[PDB]
């Protein structure tokens, strides 16, 4: 009956599938050239901007409001700093939205403006996955791309405003499970979560 249990049990296949896409397998080594890492940083920028715009839009929506943690979870500012480091101050005038990302961005804007009960799916899959790895992936990328130990370029992977990940995860669980959702909506969230993973891998599968 619990949403977190439904998610956990009903997306293991897609979650394990995601955690060894071509790009990810290389990363846990570490591998990947700077130019692929910069592209992934570019793509992640646009998708997180989209998602965090919609999450703010539905800040006071009953189905989402308890999961709204801008200061603790949002990455647009971290990704912004990272883009600044690689591309420079006018990074926004240089890069463009890649086309696998724009498919996902279009999905997120639809969900955000028509079915905000399903934002939970995109937020759960993104931020809990990120909060999980962060501290480890950060060090692999620094070592692999010779980035400054001071943090420049890997701010995306750093959750400065979260004292303990596993304790915060439990809060997020309880807030998620305390959402006033019927069983039907919970199954649709699980389906939309699997789509979140689908969207994610096909982004990462593209130079």
124 is in an annotated binding site: yes
Is there binding between residue 58 and Cl ion (CB under 5 A)?
Answer: no
Q: What are the residue ranges of helices labelled H in 115-182?
A: 119-145, 165-177
Distance in Å, CB of 163 to Cl ion, minimum: 22
Phi/psi for 63 (5° steps) reads -70, -20
Please report whether residue 86 would count as binding Cl ion according to CB under 5 A. Answer: no
66: region left, alpha or beta (phi > 0 left; psi from -120 to 50 alpha) = alpha
Binding of Cl ion by 140 (CB under 5 A)? no
Minimum separation from the CB atom of position 84 to Cl ion (A): 13
Distance of CA 137 to the CA centre of its chain: 14
180 in the Ramachandran plot: left (φ > 0), alpha (ψ -120 to 50) or beta?
A: beta
Query: In Å, what is the CA distance from 80 to each residue of 45, 75, 91, 169, 204?
Result: 7, 8, 9, 25, 19
**Contact mark string toward Cl ion, 145..164, x via CB under 5 A:** --x---x-xx----------
Binding residue per annotation — 173? yes
Output 14 or 141, the one with its CB closest to Cl ion: 141
> Is residue 142 close enough to count as binding Cl ion by CB under 5 A?
yes
Number of residues that bind Cl ion (CB under 5 A): 5
Task: Considering the complex, state which of residue 47 and residue 142 has its C-beta at the smaller distance from Cl ion.
Answer: 142
Residues placed in the known binding site for heme b = 15, 124, 169, 173
Residues placed in the known binding site = 15, 124, 169, 173
């Amino acid at each position: 009956a619990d949403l977190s249990e439904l998610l956990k049990e009903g997306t293991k296949e897609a979650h394990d599938r995601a955690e060894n896409t071509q790009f990810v397998k290389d990363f846990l080594k570490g591998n990947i050239k700077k130019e692929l890492f910069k592209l992934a940083t570019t793509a992640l920028y646009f998708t997180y901007s989209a998602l965090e715009e919609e999450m703010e839009r539905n800040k006071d929506h009953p189905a989402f409001a308890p999961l709204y943690f801008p200061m603790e979870l949002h990455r647009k500012e971290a990704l912004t700093k990272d883009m600044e480091y690689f591309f420079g101050e006018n990074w926004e005038e240089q890069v463009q939205c890649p086309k696998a990302a724009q498919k996902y961005v279009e999905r997120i804007h639809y969900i955000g403006q028509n079915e905000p009960e399903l934002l939970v799916a995109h937020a759960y899959t993104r931020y809990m996955g990120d909060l999980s790895g962060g501290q480890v992936l950060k060090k692999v990328a620094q070592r692999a791309l010779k980035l400054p130990s001071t943090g420049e370029g890997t701010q995306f992977y750093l959750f400065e405003n979260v004292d303990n990940a596993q304790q915060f995860k439990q809060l997020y669980r309880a807030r998620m499970n305390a959402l006033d959702l019927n069983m039907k909506t919970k199954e649709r969230i699980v389906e939309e979560a699997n789509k979140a993973f689908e969207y994610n891998m096909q982004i990462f599968n593209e130079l």
